[model samples]
Target chain A: SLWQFGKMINYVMGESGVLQYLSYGCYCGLGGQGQPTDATDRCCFVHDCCYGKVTGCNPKIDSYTYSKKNGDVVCGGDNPCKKQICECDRVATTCFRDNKDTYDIKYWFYGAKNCQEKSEPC
Target chain B: SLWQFGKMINYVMGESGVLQYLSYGCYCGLGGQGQPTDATDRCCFVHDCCYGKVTGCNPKIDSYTYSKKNGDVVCGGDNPCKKQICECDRVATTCFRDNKDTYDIKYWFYGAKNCQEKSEPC
Candidate 1:
């Protein structure tokens, strides 16, 4: 069935706020700039509304290995200024970029508080 | 301390796929287009990196009421074209627009599969 895509939860500030495990799923294999490969091309985190609220936020890359594994040699735990900011509201959230290299990146979340709050009405 | 923000989970396609509770936290007060208000200006779901991966995909809005309550009268549970498509990879995921009105919006996810998978090394 064609179901509407829901919002993403704040993984960085959630219960298990790990920075290394947050890697996987991309269409353009890291920073290659093209379609993703079957091995690493399948879209993992899908959000319907690109402009929503900010339930949780992250400033740094989830996993450092993924950046290296995907050929993003310049990107890793060593690269400084890889920070992210997450600001949320009752209905939507916004993500702001804080790095020096790849800055000016923002995103929105439209839905519940934490991913667990998807069922309850906000 | 300025901690790094994590990624958001696929609320629409996750385990609890509900479409009526995904609404809250928007900096631009629904569709007004401006900074958010304290009552509704405090950023909720925050994502540091706007470009990431697609763990779960959702085409529909999480909640219908939030849209209405936030002054998005035209955007209720009746917006014929409010679909979202999620495409993921190993390191990042991209979101494509499928609606008619606002069909040029896109987003990226850079992290784990389900929000629960944030801790797991995938």
Candidate 2:
């Protein structure tokens, strides 16, 4: 399927399990979602941010450096498994990156998207 | 030197940095707070939960065991830097173990305490 994203966005917030937040599209362009500023969580991309039922976030870009040339923060590095980020809205509706109520995925998310993957229609 | 606690509780989540949650006192008898169920954040005791943050949690007991021995869940073990927990009430008022708005510090919280440590007489 397809994932409708923020006006603009990037970096999710986490490396491994302790991680949270999910950003996609652009993170600083006209519509890029700014990086999640919370410290408990880390900034991440969609590829590395999502996790599985029994696994941890796999290694991907670890940190970033801003390129004065592009006015954007470049995120990518050696393989890492730091930890962090939030939910995968299963409803196929509005999603979020809420940090509040860490227990309730629906409680306090920071960023959100309409990113959808192809699921077998029942 | 007084640390008001939850109606009754135990555990602050996490050990080192990615850690979160702050629980103290009875965690099961009558008013004890249950262990924090969230994964990103952890369950911790106040003493180990709060950090200078410059460094990490000193070796407080790690993990816990339910005490049929008492009305509480016994928490203490080897020294660990597991990582977890939340805010300190500088106001000498309410403190929280919020997960939402990881940086906001006032949004989503699970446990609360008047756990005011003694400050110099103002």
Candidate 3:
């Protein structure tokens, strides 16, 4: 009860204490925010881990791209490795959409702050 | 001229001086042979590099498996990471087949000798 109340208070104060708990080995999105801030952020963390495991897949080199038929952007590739990267993004996006309610730009800001406070390569 | 003559002599003597040069990064197949023993060995080296770059793909865990209907062994997987690993093996196999002429069991033996000579984790 006390921890829950403190978490609520931390949320209200725009802090990232919960993010530290939610972290799954890596920070969410990019630039090393230390840990994930939400379920969607955790998905991104998983995606990051996926990217690091495969050959010829560079997160920096690969980005969401437009599909000719869909008119919307998704992970684009013609080869197996590229397809794997696309799969990483696809899984993360499914997570992103599923956890849309918990998605908070503010948490990212606080996560960045947490990284800076902890000297975790913000 | 002297180096060429020495290399010819070394080849006759069953040494691995050329293997050190043929090595791309890792040794052919498995174990620590210091470097590749031939062009086919170099393909294995490239495959090893590919495996290291990706996550969820462990060379130790993944190995060539027989496919249904084909009755021939290949990299098998239903997921993205596994597919990427399969691709790594596919590329290596292609290289292996292409350089079949250069494949030599003797070179592998000599490569092991070289590794032992250099104390390079044979």
Candidate 4:
């Protein structure tokens, strides 16, 4: 047959045949380079779409740190707690926006050259 | 020697001493895990913050494709050109918003766990 009918074999062994990935809207683990679907707001502050939205103590409020229009780390407590949460909010909002259009999720490995992690509509 | 005076040596060779990286801001190459500083609008629609924004012909009008408020591939021409640049516009807007606070640029390797490439201010 002109068409290589490897489809049947691929269908049976598809699960293990795929590589790791991290998509724009999906969770982190299980093969995805991104974060988890059930992740928390604090998660955004930590990794994925919004990693570093939280830095930590020492609170070096610079251009990197999350701040309001006046350019001050968005916080209240004596530590980086409020700052963390504040950045978390920003991340969460943007994250939702980023994933809003991603009906499905994932397509390839994290650093794959041309792989797309989109789940569908490709 | 115990205090690791190697710090002086590190400082001297700092530029080349640092490992490669790609940050949230910045460009796509030159040891950085992110995109370039002078990148154009369509640049984002193809990679980095907005990779896959232009998947190309065959015209996949799906959930992932960029559509306006009514959920239609924001197109005007017979080809995917309009859609390609349309998504580019979205990326450009979001990119500006994301970097509005970033006075400098970059921190570390994009996927470099918790590593912040943010220049200055910790």
Q: Candidate 4 on A1-122: residue-level lDDT in tens?
A: 00011111122223221111112223221112222333321232234333333345311122222333331223244445544544434444344334434423332222322222332110
User: Hey, what RMSD does candidate 3 come out at?
Assistant: 22.7
Q: Is candidate 1 or candidate 3 better by TM-score?
A: 3
DockQ values per model: 0.05, 0.05, 0.01, 0.02
Shift in Å, residue B85, candidate 1: 7.8
Return the TM-score for candidate 3, rounded to 2 decimals: 0.32
Best by lDDT: 3
Note the chain A TM-score of all models in turn. Answer: 0.17, 0.18, 0.55, 0.26
lDDT (tens digit, per residue) of candidate 2 on B11-92? 2222321222221121100112223233222322233234323135422222222222233223233433332211221111
lDDT of prediction 3: 0.43
Error in Å for residue A118 of model 4: 2.6
Name the 10 consecutive residues with the lowest summed lDDT in model 1 chain A: A89-98
lDDT minimum window of 10 residues, candidate 1 chain B: B89-98
Which residue pairs show backbone clashes in model 3?
A53-B54, A53-B55, A54-B54, A54-B55
Per-model TM-score on C-alpha atoms: 0.17, 0.20, 0.32, 0.21
**How far does residue B117 in candidate 2 sit from its true spot (Å)?**
25
Compare candidates 3 and 4 on lDDT and give the better one.
Answer: 3
Tell me how far the alpha carbon of residue B108 in candidate 4 is from the true structure, in angstroms, after superposition: 7.6
Best by DockQ: 2
Evaluated at residue A35, the lDDT of candidate 3 is: 46
Q: In terms of docking quality, how is candidate 4 classified? A: incorrect
Per residue, candidate 3 scores C-alpha lDDT tens digits across B1-122 of: 11221233234323332332222223443333344556766675676567666686554344433242332234455666766765665565456556767665444313122332231221
Give me the runs in candidate 4 sitting further than 4 Å from their true place: A1-46, A49-115, A119-122, B1-35, B39-103, B106-122
